[PDB]
């Protein structure tokens, strides 16, 4: 069955835009990485990153858990649970 239940974990990035996001699910880890250039100056650029890291194997199987994303940086991982 691979557990019939719709499971959802949410990943939150407070404010970023989807093009500056990378969502990665790798086995037992579900992580979201966002990186944005904040302020560009002289020859100095300033960047900020958001990384949320989860390690959940019992709750996450990469074959059934999928990711949906909102424009603000909210990422939701959903699918049948393990």
Q: Rounded distance, CA 19 to CA 79, Å?
A: 23
Pairing of strands 44-55, 66-69: unpaired
Contact with a copy of itself (CB under 8 A): which of 20, 52, 69, 78?
52
Q: Which residue has the tokens 């835009």?
A: 17
User: Smallest distance from the beta carbon of 80 to a copy of itself, in angstroms?
Assistant: 18
Residue 4's CB is within 10 A of a number of other CB atoms, namely 7
Is 26 an interacting residue with respect to a copy of itself (CB under 8 A)?
no
46 touches a copy of itself (CB under 8 A): yes
How far is residue 29's CA from residue 18's CA, in Å, rounded to a whole number? 20
Q: Which stretch binds a copy of itself (CB under 8 A): 6-14, 18-26, 63-71?
A: 6-14
Which segments are annotated as binding site for Zn(2+)? Answer: 15, 36, 38, 43, 51
Residues lying near a copy of itself in the complex (CB under 8 A) are found at 9, 11-12, 30, 38-39, 42-56
């Amino acid at each position: 069955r691979l557990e019939k239940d719709r499971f959802s974990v949410n990943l939150d990035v407070k404010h970023f835009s989807p093009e500056e996001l990378k969502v990665k699910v790798l086995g037992d880890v579900i992580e979201v990485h966002g990186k944005h250039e904040e302020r560009q100056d002289e020859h100095g650029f300033i960047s900020r990153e958001f990384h949320r890291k989860y390690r959940i194997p019992a709750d996450v199987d990469p074959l059934t858990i999928t990711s949906s994303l909102s424009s603000d940086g909210v990422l939701t991982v959903n699918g049948p649970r393990k």
